[PDB]
Amino acid sequence: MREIVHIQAGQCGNQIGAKFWEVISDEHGIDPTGTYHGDSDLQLDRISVYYNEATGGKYVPRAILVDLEPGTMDSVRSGPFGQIFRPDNFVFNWAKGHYTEGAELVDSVLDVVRKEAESCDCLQGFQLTHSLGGGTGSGMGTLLISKIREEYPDRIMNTFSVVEEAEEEA
Amino acid sequence: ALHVPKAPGFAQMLKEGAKHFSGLEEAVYRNIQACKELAQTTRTAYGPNGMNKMVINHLEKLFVTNDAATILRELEVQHPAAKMIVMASHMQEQEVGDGTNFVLVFAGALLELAEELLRIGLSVSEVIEGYEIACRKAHEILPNLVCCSAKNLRDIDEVSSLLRTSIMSKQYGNEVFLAKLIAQACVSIFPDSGHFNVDNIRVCKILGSGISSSSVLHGMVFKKETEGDVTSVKDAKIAVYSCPFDGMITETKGTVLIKTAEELMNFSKGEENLMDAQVKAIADTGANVVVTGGKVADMALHYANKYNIMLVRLNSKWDLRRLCKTVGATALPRLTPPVLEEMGHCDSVYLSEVGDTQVVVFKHEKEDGAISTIVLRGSTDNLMDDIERAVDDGVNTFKVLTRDKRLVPGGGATEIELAKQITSYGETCPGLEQYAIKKFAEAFEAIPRALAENSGVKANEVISKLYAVHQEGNKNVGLDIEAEVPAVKDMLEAGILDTYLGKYWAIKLATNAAVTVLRVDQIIMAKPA
Amino acid sequence: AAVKTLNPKAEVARAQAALAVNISAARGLQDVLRTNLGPKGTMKMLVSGAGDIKLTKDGNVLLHEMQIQHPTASLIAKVATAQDDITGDGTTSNVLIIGELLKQADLYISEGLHPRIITEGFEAAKEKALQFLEEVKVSREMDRETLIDVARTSLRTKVHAELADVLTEAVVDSILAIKKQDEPIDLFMIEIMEMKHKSETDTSLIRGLVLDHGARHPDMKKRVEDAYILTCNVSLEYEKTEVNSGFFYKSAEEREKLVKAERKFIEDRVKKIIELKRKVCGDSDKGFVVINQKGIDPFSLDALSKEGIVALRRAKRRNMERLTLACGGVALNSFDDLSPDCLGHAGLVYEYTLGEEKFTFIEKCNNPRSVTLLIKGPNKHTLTQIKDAVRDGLRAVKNAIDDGCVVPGAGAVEVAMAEALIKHKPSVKGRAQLGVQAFADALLIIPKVLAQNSGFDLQETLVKIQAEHSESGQLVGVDLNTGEPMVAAEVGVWDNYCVKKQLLHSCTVIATNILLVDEIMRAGMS
Amino acid sequence: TPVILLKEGTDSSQGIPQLVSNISACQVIAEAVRTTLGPRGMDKLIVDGRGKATISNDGATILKLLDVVHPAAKTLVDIAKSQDAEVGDGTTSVTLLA
Ligand SMILES: Nc1ncnc2c1ncn2[C@@H]1O[C@H](COP(=O)(O)OP(=O)(O)O)[C@@H](O)[C@H]1O
Ligand SMILES: Nc1ncnc2c1ncn2[C@@H]1O[C@H](COP(=O)(O)OP(=O)(O)O)[C@@H](O)[C@H]1O
Ligand SMILES: [Mg+2]
Numbered sequence A: 001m002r003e004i005v006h007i008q009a010g011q012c013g014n015q016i017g018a019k020f021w022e023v024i025s026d027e028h029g030i031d032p033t034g035t036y037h038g039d040s041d042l043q044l045d046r047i048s049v050y051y052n053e054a055t056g057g058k059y060v061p062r063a064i065l066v067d068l069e070p071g072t073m074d075s076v077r078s079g080p081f082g083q084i085f086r087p088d089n090f091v092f093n094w095a096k097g098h099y100t101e102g103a104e105l106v107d108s109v110l111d112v113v114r115k116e117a118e119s120c121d122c123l124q125g126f127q128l129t130h131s132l133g134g135g136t137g138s139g140m141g142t143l144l145i146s147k148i149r150e151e152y153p154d155r156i157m158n159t160f161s162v163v164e165e166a167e168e169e170a
Numbered sequence B: 001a002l003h004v005p006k007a008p009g010f011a012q013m014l015k016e017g018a019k020h021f022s023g024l025e026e027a028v029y030r031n032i033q034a035c036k037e038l039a040q041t042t043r044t045a046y047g048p049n050g051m052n053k054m055v056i057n058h059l060e061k062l063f064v065t066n067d068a069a070t071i072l073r074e075l076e077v078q079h080p081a082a083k084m085i086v087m088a089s090h091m092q093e094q095e096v097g098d099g100t101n102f103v104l105v106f107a108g109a110l111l112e113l114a115e116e117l118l119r120i121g122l123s124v125s126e127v128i129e130g131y132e133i134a135c136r137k138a139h140e141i142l143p144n145l146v147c148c149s150a151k152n153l154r155d156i157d158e159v160s161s162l163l164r165t166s167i168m169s170k171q172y173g174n175e176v177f178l179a180k181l182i183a184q185a186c187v188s189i190f191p192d193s194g195h196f197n198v199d200n201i202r203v204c205k206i207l208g209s210g211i212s213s214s215s216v217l218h219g220m221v222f223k224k225e226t227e228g229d230v231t232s233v234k235d236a237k238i239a240v241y242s243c244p245f246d247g248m249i250t251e252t253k254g255t256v257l258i259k260t261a262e263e264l265m266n267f268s269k270g271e272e273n274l275m276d277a278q279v280k281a282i283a284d285t286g287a288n289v290v291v292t293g294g295k296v297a298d299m300a301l302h303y304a305n306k307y308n309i310m311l312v313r314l315n316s317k318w319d320l321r322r323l324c325k326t327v328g329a330t331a332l333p334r335l336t337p338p339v340l341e342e343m344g345h346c347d348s349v350y351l352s353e354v355g356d357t358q359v360v361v362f363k364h365e366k367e368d369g370a371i372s373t374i375v376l377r378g379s380t381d382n383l384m385d386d387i388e389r390a391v392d393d394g395v396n397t398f399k400v401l402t403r404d405k406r407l408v409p410g411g412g413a414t415e416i417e418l419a420k421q422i423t424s425y426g427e428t429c430p431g432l433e434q435y436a437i438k439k440f441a442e443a444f445e446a447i448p449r450a451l452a453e454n455s456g457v458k459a460n461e462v463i464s465k466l467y468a469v470h471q472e473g474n475k476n477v478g479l480d481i482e483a484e485v486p487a488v489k490d491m492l493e494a495g496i497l498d499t500y501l502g503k504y505w506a507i508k509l510a511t512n513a514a515v516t517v518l519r520v521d522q523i524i525m526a527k528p529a
Numbered sequence C: 001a002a003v004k005t006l007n008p009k010a011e012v013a014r015a016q017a018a019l020a021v022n023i024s025a026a027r028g029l030q031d032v033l034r035t036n037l038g039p040k041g042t043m044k045m046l047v048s049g050a051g052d053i054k055l056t057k058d059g060n061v062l063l064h065e066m067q068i069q070h071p072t073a074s075l076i077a078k079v080a081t082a083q084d085d086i087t088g089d090g091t092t093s094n095v096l097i098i099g100e101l102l103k104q105a106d107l108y109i110s111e112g113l114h115p116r117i118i119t120e121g122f123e124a125a126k127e128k129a130l131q132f133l134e135e136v137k138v139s140r141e142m143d144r145e146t147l148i149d150v151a152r153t154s155l156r157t158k159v160h161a162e163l164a165d166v167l168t169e170a171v172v173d174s175i176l177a178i179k180k181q182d183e184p185i186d187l188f189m190i191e192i193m194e195m196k197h198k199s200e201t202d203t204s205l206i207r208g209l210v211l212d213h214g215a216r217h218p219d220m221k222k223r224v225e226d227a228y229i230l231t232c233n234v235s236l237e238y239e240k241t242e243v244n245s246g247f248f249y250k251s252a253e254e255r256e257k258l259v260k261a262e263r264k265f266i267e268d269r270v271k272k273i274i275e276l277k278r279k280v281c282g283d284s285d286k287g288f289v290v291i292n293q294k295g296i297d298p299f300s301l302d303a304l305s306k307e308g309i310v311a312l313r314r315a316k317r318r319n320m321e322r323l324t325l326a327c328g329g330v331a332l333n334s335f336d337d338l339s340p341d342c343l344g345h346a347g348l349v350y351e352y353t354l355g356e357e358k359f360t361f362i363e364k365c366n367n368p369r370s371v372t373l374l375i376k377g378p379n380k381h382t383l384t385q386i387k388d389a390v391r392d393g394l395r396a397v398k399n400a401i402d403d404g405c406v407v408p409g410a411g412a413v414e415v416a417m418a419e420a421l422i423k424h425k426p427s428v429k430g431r432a433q434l435g436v437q438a439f440a441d442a443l444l445i446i447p448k449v450l451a452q453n454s455g456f457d458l459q460e461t462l463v464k465i466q467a468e469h470s471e472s473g474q475l476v477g478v479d480l481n482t483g484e485p486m487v488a489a490e491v492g493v494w495d496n497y498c499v500k501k502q503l504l505h506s507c508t509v510i511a512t513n514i515l516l517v518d519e520i521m522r523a524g525m526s
Numbered sequence D: 001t002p003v004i005l006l007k008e009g010t011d012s013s014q015g016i017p018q019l020v021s022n023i024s025a026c027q028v029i030a031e032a033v034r035t036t037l038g039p040r041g042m043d044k045l046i047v048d049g050r051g052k053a054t055i056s057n058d059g060a061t062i063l064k065l066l067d068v069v070h071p072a073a074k075t076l077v078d079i080a081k082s083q084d085a086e087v088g089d090g091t092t093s094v095t096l097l098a
């Protein structure tokens, strides 16, 4: 219940999100291969707010990874805990023509977040982790917050933004 | 000395770390080498006499198996051609579930045979057309070799005899026992309608005694513990709930507001009375056991123990659905006394101990039920995993037999017959594709050759004897494993059969993968990240 | 240099060096891209840094996935991208003709000429070529056989014949089925879906819709034989008030009352749907399907399933228009004015499962104005290649319909323009005749490349082709299996008029602009 | 040689030598608990990374305390654990027999 989905954008944003998912996984009973060892029931009460359980007992995070580079997502995958992410939750020259650049990337992101929000029951929000002063956080992030708001103008959108002599009569 | 600077154009405009391969000498002859080496890697795990292989993955986890798909999954491949062969094998596993090594052997043989045609002069297109024609001819020929179709898929002995082979190819010696177990488990859950879901067979592993102490159970077992004082029920009426077993609260933030002292003195008493009323209302319908998917409260547990209610909490969100299917109940999203239609019935519900493991068992006497479980007992987790994989292959074979009823002889007889007939056909074709057709026919001997090599005999004598006996009109003669001298045996009498659909799909996918590898001309690689 | 004395870290290339660099880059690009042209071209494999595999033959994909860091390559890639996104074809010929134009221009510039003379010659030759193309075209009625020929010609250059014959019929049928005799064709009404099994020869066209999600409640029916369809984007989840609110109760009974009372807003909508269903489908003979663009609570799912309703949640926005066009209903944002006139009809609804994925089929619509192309195959790269080919074919057929004319192919048009320009050039005054000659020689690259790829002798084949078309006024092109001259129109090789027009314009403009660059400088911030 | 099949760092060993190596390693594993059998058997002392000591005569406990990472040797630890879980006695004899 009260499902929340996560968006990671940029190199540093991707790294911060990977760290957060690592630490929350160690806090819970989740291990790198997607199974459960925790001994306390309180580690499993709210597991569905952050994880989808697949047929067979495996758990996958409710996270989306985006960068305009074929190396950042590969680095995350190579790094530990990068294999637990679903292989199709990745979005990947800089400027072509088209009169608008990134229109296909934003559409792919919207499709993936729609597919992810389909699985959850009563989702409530999006946690966006991106650079703020960066080019990907201002320009290449072509008002992605605005696009998300237009797509779902009823749910919360919580963003972790990186920070005198004349003095006479009157 | 001096240096060769660079070539103008693309060679200068290329990025740093990128690779560009072009031509027959730099692309095709290297892709063939990579595929041949990949096939040679897993050649030795083919047949009943295949040897196990030990692989450690990047997380220091240990695998011991002779299943080709598992080996390829655990290995990590850096070469694109081997990657495409691996994807072909995985697609075959997804489509049928058995025959993942035949694909690799066939593709490797086809490529290593096309190499010499390319060497002697034929171009890639003439090889491709010959391969396609030969594949179509093989698919046309294949049905005529069908023999001994399945008759009854609800007879225990016939099912065991049909499933024996696919298990015997992995567990040499335990095949009879495993076939009996899997036949019982599969026949138990097979409905009147043809629909047979593979997911309805569950496997549970308990450390302990030997494999011979495995068993099958008509119901469900969970590695859990009873939350209440009651431990056993002899005729169980089950209630199932998806919500937590506690008094519910508002979705919006709530607050208890009090302005006098009587409310403060009466709140907790009222809450306790309300919970007691709800629990007794549930218990009045006759429910003995309550299954919940969430948290239980101390007061609820106290009243459930007071009214002699067995309380089990299982939590997967899928085990709950499987239990609902098993018993015949419907999960209730609110805590209300169930109606009879929503009430499940199970004969025995109890808590037991097996080899230092506490389990909860829901058991029926019905031979059909809805699902069934297989309890495996082994001395090693790796051994239990291997037996689990064998059981999975048996179940997949049963499902394929449900889909299609036709069988063909095995142990090299089908491959020898196909090779002979394709050679006879390709003899009469004028043109430059006859060489490709003859090579496609010759590539079929790799399977009996691998079987003979693994068995430990001389493959040439086996192949010569197979050809000699097939020239007289004996279509059901294949390799003999038991003898120490190379010999042949009638496969139809011995009961070594295999499915038609598996061979069909394996040939199709292997040919497609081989021609796809052959079609590539030049390769551009970016630097790894 | 002047720039160096101000910024010592700058980089510069002056008059001759700039021209040399540009010509070298163009020739380097064309040397690689020349092997794609024609149905006899070879396939390139591209491997990225992540380890993915892409088999391709299209010029644009090769340009944007080959590893290059050159400014002239960037300009040419941008031009190819514009060509692709406007017309949908002709990306390789663009690069070929640009490279040949630059090479032929440098051939004369190396003898002391000035680029402006060649520029004027280029302009005059372009005007003459456009005039000739305007008259060489063939106007027809654009019937099914002509569209089949055009689509087969456009698709045979990407996949083999066996798969091309399958794809051509599906593409033509979809385009014809979503067409009315006005209101120019609007894509996004054809959905492209891919399912990974059942080898590609099973790719098909469905006169209905396929959705990549299915029913979420176990007890919902798996197949409906005669379905009313309701399409909506109203929310059936729990909703919180915009202004901050909180419950203040005194006892457990009051808490229970509030808990019961906090659901009436959604239960009212569920009741409205149920009443409409019971009003329309009186007896248990028909079926009811609901499609919602927003979420549905488990309580609402159970309430709907108790009465035999098949509900799907969180569909995509474009499906709101697609389902309306296909089934023939009304997409509505509120249930205040619900009536049977807002319902649609579908002759079959069912469900398919692929391991961890689920699909829903809506089929047997009365007169659908929207269809779906179902792609199948055993590999991700196979699916991607087929998707690109389908895009190419759809664009080609749509352009052929939009234009009233089609043009013969296989280099016949290039031969004809070269012959016409050769006779035109004596009328020009000055040295622009050299530019006209260069333009013609550049135009003669396509038949040469086709012959080279098919495996013949370029000079001899072109000499034969020019030997015909001069003693007989026929439009003559190259036969790719014998090397002999042929007549394109009788054999059935066709090309688009807009593609040729755009290609000529873009190539001439880019060549003229490139030839006039005086220096290349990088003197800004690093 | 230009492009290799598997990733660099992979190690492989096949044939009679690796089987002989496995047989050799099992001998060391059995030698680890050899002298703890019978009425006149001694016991062992194991010190871990944190300085905590464990004095034991139980074969399963000793084998668990040893940090065995040999894939063939791990089987002898597994069977000892299985015996301990199943019957609770006889953990050294099974390893010696194997
Ligand atoms: N008793 C047997 N005698 C001879 N051949 C056998 C016997 N059992 C199985 N085979 C053969 O083993 C071959 C391969 O089976 P297996 O080794 O399991 O790999 P896969 O089935 O994945 O290709 C089959 O073609 C079958 O003909
Ligand atoms: N069967 C054919 N015979 C001769 N020429 C053909 C045939 N099919 C296509 N062509 C030619 O191939 C040319 C290039 O098409 P293609 O290779 O697909 O790349 P592009 O369409 O991007 O230029 C077209 O101009 C067309 O005239
Ligand atoms: Mg097998």
Ligand SMILES: [Mg+2]
Residues within 6 Å of the ligand: C089, C090, C154, C157, C392
């Ligand atoms: Mg084209």
Ligand SMILES: [Mg+2]
Residues within 6 Å of the ligand: D089, D090, D091
């Ligand atoms: Mg003892």
